Design a protein around this ligand. Structure first.
Ligand SMILES: O=C1/C(=C/c2c[nH]c3ccccc23)Oc2c1ccc(O)c2CN1CCCCCC1
Length: 261
């Protein structure tokens, strides 16, 4: 049913190949049964999570199908072409212009709101888990493998990216969903405007003091420092982020593509 192309990447979860449906581009993701920690209804949680979010259009990668095998699951995912993940795109072009960071950040926030509206919390938002559809100028979120059903009580597990994790996890091994998500969005927007993440080490995370290494407007610094408030409840809601003066007059993905890509 698919034509396996070349390997696109791999970790200790699995391996993802480029592929063609027999005519659409897809990505074929192989996950080891040995290596899954969280299961759902029996399937890897990613599958539960993607079915929940994969209705309709959005800035989330769609699950086209999946298969079980003796020792592994295989997920069949949308693949835009051409595409570049945001970690790459930042490595290559350095810190982004504010206008482009605003366009990308908005789309991320729309994708994250959509997951929450569907009861899904991603738990590993970061540049590497974001794909850019270069022709249309649209961002898509990938890798729901550390996700969870969204809930209002405390989380005690985390298998996301440490440097993107908030102070309350580092210190207490506890966080709530939306507020830990807003923190990682703070790390992400800093990453976009500065070209790298603000904190490398547990104690800089706990300290939460933000130093800017690049010229960044004041409103953006304000937004970033707000998402990165040490007390969870001092962090903005998604709505407050989107009503932030720095977020006004965002460009369309298509204008973003014409100007910047
Ligand atoms: O869940 C994953 C996914 C889904 C895709 C859906 N369409 C695509 C198109 C290209 C690449 C990946 C995809 O790609 C994944 C996933 C999990 C881990 C991982 O290391 C990759 C491959 N990645 C490409 C290289 C950058 C580092 C991470 C992203």
């Amino acid at each position: 049913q698919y034509q396996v192309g070349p390997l696109l990447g791999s970790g200790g979860f699995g391996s993802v190949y480029s592929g063609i449906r027999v005519n659409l581009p897809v990505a074929i993701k192989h996950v080891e049964k040995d290596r899954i920690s969280d299961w759902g209804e029996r399937v890897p949680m990613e599958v539960v999570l993607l079915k929940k979010v994969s209705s309709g259009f959005s800035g989330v990668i769609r699950l086209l199908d999946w298969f079980e095998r003796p020792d592994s699951f295989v997920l069949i995912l949308e693949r835009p072409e051409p595409v570049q993940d945001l970690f790459d795109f930042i490595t290559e072009r350095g810190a982004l212009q504010e206008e482009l960071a605003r366009s990308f950040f908005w789309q991320v926030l729309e994708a994250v709101r959509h997951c929450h509206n569907c009861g899904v919390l991603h738990r590993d938002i970061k540049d590497e888990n974001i794909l850019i559809d270069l022709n249309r100028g649209e961002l898509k979120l990938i890798d729901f493998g550390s996700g969870a059903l969204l809930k209002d009580t405390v989380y005690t597990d985390f298998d996301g990216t440490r440097v993107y994790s908030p102070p309350e996890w580092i210190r207490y091994h506890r966080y709530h969903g939306r507020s830990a998500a807003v923190w990682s969005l703070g790390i992400l927007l800093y990453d976009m405007v500065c070209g790298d993440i603000p904190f490398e080490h547990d104690e800089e995370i706990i300290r939460g003091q933000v130093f800017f290494r690049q010229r960044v407007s004041s409103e953006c610094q304000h937004l970033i420092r707000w998402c990165l408030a040490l007390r969870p409840s001092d962090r903005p809601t998604f709505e407050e982020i989107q009503n932030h003066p720095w977020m006004q007059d965002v460009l369309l993905p298509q204008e973003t593509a014409e100007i910047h890509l």
